[PDB]
Design a protein around this ligand. Structure first.
Ligand SMILES: Nc1nc2c(ncn2[C@@H]2O[C@H]3COP(=O)(O)O[C@@H]3[C@H]2O)c(=O)[nH]1
Ligand SMILES: Nc1nc2c(ncn2[C@@H]2O[C@H]3COP(=O)(O)O[C@@H]3[C@H]2O)c(=O)[nH]1
Ligand SMILES: Nc1nc2c(ncn2[C@@H]2O[C@H]3COP(=O)(O)O[C@@H]3[C@H]2O)c(=O)[nH]1
Ligand SMILES: Nc1nc2c(ncn2[C@@H]2O[C@H]3COP(=O)(O)O[C@@H]3[C@H]2O)c(=O)[nH]1
Lengths: 197, 197, 197, 197
């Protein structure tokens, strides 16, 4: 069947590409390991480009069904109301991180925020000699950069394979200003996290 | 023949996608019902991407032929003149809404305006305990947000399948300022509608 | 051979599209007449998407070869120097207008300027009861809108099939400010044309 | 195999295109010579569109492997640290210039900077009667326009085939402000180069 059969073929080209510039065995394995994870988690199907078919209301509906877990697992996302969920659901970008991979490095100027569906990460100091926290499902990170209007306060490494939902700075900012009650909670956590650290 | 035969195949992939993440029977039926409506109303043909072939004047001409109904059915669109019709016709985006679907929710920050070619909608209060109006062909909604410079003053639900023409905020604003006489009429309706409600 | 054989097939879809929404015989003939002109003038080949293959210097070189006529036919374009020609050549968009078609209508807010490679046009008053000029190869129009910072001062209709080169407002403005000597000439013509009219 | 077999076919269309508008023998040879160089240097493979498959961390990793030479050959790029390399690596665009081709012309308003992986160039005065320098691997040019906030101070011609890495003005500016120590060095070279010349 179709991309049963098309997703098996994009790795055929990518692997060929990896051999021709002779990519290190370690990196090649990472890439193959990523695509194996992609094919079994999402079936490597462009949820990007089949939702593109649908009109707003039907994409909204589908998105809220396939991505229902994260609203659920995150205490801040539930009790937020239907309003909030509809407003943010189409802006939560699913992203996969391999074990040991760096999501955020302390000192960077990014302000994207990440929500943990599946997996766990570690929050580290800049020299990586200190571990401040392990974070897992229902918890989020990357919020302090925008709220404290500062560079990344810490380094965040995936401890395992991670299903994360990335929320861009603009939407994050837009959402923060549109929901003060939720914004107050995130702001307080951020200060709580920085009068720690 | 061609997309007689290509439009039958994009539903083959989308349906497969719906089964793999196990989308609810109700949502799956909505999607299939939408595409059946798409295939019989537009023959599911990319009027998007065949007009893309043509130069401005020929796209202008084709658009004014295939989308002649809405200029006609809307009293404000006729007597407006050739000037106005040419200026707006390529900015009226055809959009389909299924019965019972929410086009607008009271309190949202959108300013898109919708023109009803075919079908009917209901204008509701925020708690949906009050029905202010049923709107059908020749009538429009979604204009009060920009004119009153406010969030959506009401909720608008499709009562049936609807062929709507969406006009984006920027073009709506551009059109309003470019035609004061038409703008005066819309402004007056908006105030009339808000000293009701 | 290839798009010998692909350009014959895009008209197969477009014609089918024209029959399904039953486009007027007159408009259908215009469209077919346009594509016949396209296939014999350019061989309907995407000079758009084969130049896309090439690096800047080679696209620059090819553009200056295939589009050498207009630099030549326009007195203002020659003696301008290599500097000027290189700076503008990749911004002159080839556009085709059928006989009798409206390129510009008096009162519109566009500021695109057009250069006549092949064909002739007529410059008309707003009510089209007055003909101010016939313009042909080496001559240009659509410059007065930006220079007089005004709406289109007149209506311009193609008298024949026309090969025009469209120069967008931003590039036109950028070019005007970058070459004062050429700008002075265009400015003077524009005032000369408006203390006529 | 695949684009072993697809890259042989894009030249089939481009060559056909070159014959139909009868491109000069000299330009046709340049284009064929470019694509022969493309097919043997990169195997004409879209490193553009296979990296597009990968998530950020894996594209970052691959980019730093395939494009490791330039960080190495350029004294300013080494000792800069991992921070700097990660920040810039995905912004260094590989570009190929044929022998004798003009990369930069004195007086132009561009501010793109170029890093020489392979090949050599010559830095010339505006009238091209003076040769200020030959530049090769590990050296860069095109930095003075932004730093002196001026038009191109000189003309730069490829003496041979060149593998260059282009860094756009915005990223160049962003990088300059983000790393003052490296910025100081480039600024000093630019002044040193202009109190020469
Ligand atoms: N759990 C926990 N997360 C922290 C702490 N300090 C910073 N972070 C998270 O990791 C930080 C990563 O850098 P940001 O400044 O992106 O904000 C993110 C915070 O969400 C801490 O003490 N505990
Ligand atoms: N017909 C009718 N439409 C209304 C009324 N109040 C609001 N609307 C329409 O529905 C509103 C939807 O929210 P907007 O503020 O988008 O402006 C839209 C108005 O076009 C009303 O009293 N009658
Ligand atoms: N040849 C000629 N062209 C004119 C005259 N008046 C306006 N135009 C051209 O036609 C005008 C079309 O509107 P613009 O204001 O685009 O500027 C264009 C001018 O180039 C005129 O008297 N003679
Ligand atoms: N090597 C050398 N490069 C120069 C000199 N003057 C200008 N350039 C380089 O060539 C210049 C090309 O124009 P820019 O102003 O792009 O800045 C570039 C400088 O990198 C010079 O005297 N020596």
């Amino acid at each position: 069947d179709a991309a049963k059969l098309l997703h098996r073929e994009r790795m055929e080209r990518v692997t060929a590409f990896l051999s021709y510039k002779k990519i290190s065995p370690e990196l090649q394995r990472r890439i193959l390991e990523y695509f194996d994870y992609l094919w079994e988690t999402r079936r490597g199907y462009e949820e990007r480009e089949v939702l593109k078919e649908l009109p707003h209301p039907l994409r909204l509906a589908v998105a809220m069904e396939i991505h229902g877990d994260v609203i659920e697992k995150v205490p801040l996302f539930k009790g937020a109301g239907e309003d909030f969920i509809r407003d943010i659901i189409l802006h939560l970008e699913p992203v996969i991180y391999g074990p040991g991979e760096y999501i955020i490095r302390a000192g960077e100027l990014g302000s994207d925020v990440y929500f943990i569906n599946r997996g766990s990460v570690e929050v580290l100091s800049a020299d990586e000699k200190t571990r401040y926290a392990i974070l897992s499902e229902g918890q989020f990170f990357g919020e302090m950069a925008l709220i404290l209007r500062a560079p990344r306060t810490a380094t965040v490494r995936a401890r395992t394979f991670c299903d994360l939902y990335r929320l861009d700075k603009e939407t994050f900012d837009r959402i923060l200003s549109r929901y003060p009650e939720i914004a107050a909670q995130i702001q307080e956590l951020a200060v709580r996290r920085k009068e720690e650290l």
